[PDB]
Amino acid sequence: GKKKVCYYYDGDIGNYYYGQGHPMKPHRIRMTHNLLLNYGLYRKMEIYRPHKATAEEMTKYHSDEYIKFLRSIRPDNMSEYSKQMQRFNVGEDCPVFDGLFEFCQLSTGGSVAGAVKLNRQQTDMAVNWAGGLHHAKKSEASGFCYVNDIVLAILELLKYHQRVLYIDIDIHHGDGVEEAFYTTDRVMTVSFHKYGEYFPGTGDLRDIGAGKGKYYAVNFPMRDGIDDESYGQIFKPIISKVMEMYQPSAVVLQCGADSLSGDRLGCFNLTVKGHAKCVEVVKTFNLPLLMLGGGGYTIRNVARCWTYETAVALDCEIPNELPYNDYFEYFGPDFKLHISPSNMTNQNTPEYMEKIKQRLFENLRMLP
Ligand SMILES: CCC(O)(O)CCCCC[C@H](NC(=O)[C@H]1CC12CCN(C)CC2)c1nc(-c2ccc(F)cc2)[nH]c1C#N
Numbered sequence: 001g002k003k004k005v006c007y008y009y010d011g012d013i014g015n016y017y018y019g020q021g022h023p024m025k026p027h028r029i030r031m032t033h034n035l036l037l038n039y040g041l042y043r044k045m046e047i048y049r050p051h052k053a054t055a056e057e058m059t060k061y062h063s064d065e066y067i068k069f070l071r072s073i074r075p076d077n078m079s080e081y082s083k084q085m086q087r088f089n090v091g092e093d094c095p096v097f098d099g100l101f102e103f104c105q106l107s108t109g110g111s112v113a114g115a116v117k118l119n120r121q122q123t124d125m126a127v128n129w130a131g132g133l134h135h136a137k138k139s140e141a142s143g144f145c146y147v148n149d150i151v152l153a154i155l156e157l158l159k160y161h162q163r164v165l166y167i168d169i170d171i172h173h174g175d176g177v178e179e180a181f182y183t184t185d186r187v188m189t190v191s192f193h194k195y196g197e198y199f200p201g202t203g204d205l206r207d208i209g210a211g212k213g214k215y216y217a218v219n220f221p222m223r224d225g226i227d228d229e230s231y232g233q234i235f236k237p238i239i240s241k242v243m244e245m246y247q248p249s250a251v252v253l254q255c256g257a258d259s260l261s262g263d264r265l266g267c268f269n270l271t272v273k274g275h276a277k278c279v280e281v282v283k284t285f286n287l288p289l290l291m292l293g294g295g296g297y298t299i300r301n302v303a304r305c306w307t308y309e310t311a312v313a314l315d316c317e318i319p320n321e322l323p324y325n326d327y328f329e330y331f332g333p334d335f336k337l338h339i340s341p342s343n344m345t346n347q348n349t350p351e352y353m354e355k356i357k358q359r360l361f362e363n364l365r366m367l368p
């Protein structure tokens, strides 16, 4: 039936600024919050302000030197860290900005606090829209990500759960999470992403894990223009097969909204309903679930998407007519919650979708 939902948000998150021209806008988290407050979604949800994760909590995965660097660098002292910046990939994609470390602490705090709440059996679902920064590596920032809150939250879930399933619906391959757990069978990573002349360049169908982790990494490579029909054709059958064979006791779902139609960086054609159908599918398995954010670069659509996915988590129907809110003008000319797909061609033929699904099914047959 209906589940208890705990939601993590810090009112300062929207003030962090990556810089002029940078597509990552933390303000979209504040737009999501304001929209869901104006729809009345706060009435059946426990809202918590995450603690600022310590350097010590972050070093459960990241190197001591990398976290010390993140804690020390500032725009005013950047000139003295040119060597470490190159070493840690801090530059155009992952710039130095005022409050960078505090931003990482809040993003991470929400994910780890949600995992603790799930471990204590005090909630069925935990939501942290400020998390899902899937590209960060042990000693390297990458793709707008500095601290991998997902890996840290999974490490927390591993204290009480033998097997944890990670599902990533961001348009980009979840490389940092896949790499962290590549040689273990205690985490199965499943990523659906655009593959081919696209960042980060990894996530080939043939990358299935290594050593004890062989068959525990699943990658579904897609082409431009995937729509609700095509995505729905493979998501439920793949997740159902993974659930059947792997039998996880907890799930982490990265809900990157850059897979929506009209995204500034993405090339997919999903609507908010098509994207949210993934949340509905995962929720049906009745397992402890940590829902996280991620990409999303047309910020009015990110707010619509995550507001609707929070409503899905709560089993609350919300009207298509947007309620008045602090960012109402961003939602014109229609002022509706749901979006229409574009006329872009879907390069993912039905035959291609079935063929990739059959190859993934062959790999899933190799599990014990
Ligand atoms: C939060 C999860 C996520 O949604 O999955 C993250 C997506 C990361 C995309 C990284 C990609 N970077 C590149 O394409 C690398 C190859 C370059 C090109 C851009 N330059 C700035 C660096 C090298 C990229 N960088 C940018 C960018 C644009 C303007 C800026 F002022 C700064 C950066 N755009 C893109 C894309 N696509």
Ligand SMILES: [Ca+2]
Residues within 6 Å of the ligand: 168, 169, 170, 171, 172, 173, 174, 191, 192, 193
């Ligand atoms: Ca993905």
Ligand SMILES: [Ca+2]
Residues within 6 Å of the ligand: 181, 182, 183, 184, 185, 187, 188, 189, 209, 213, 216, 217
């Ligand atoms: Ca794995």
Ligand SMILES: [Zn+2]
Residues within 6 Å of the ligand: 170, 171, 172, 256, 258, 294, 295, 296
């Ligand atoms: Zn992305």
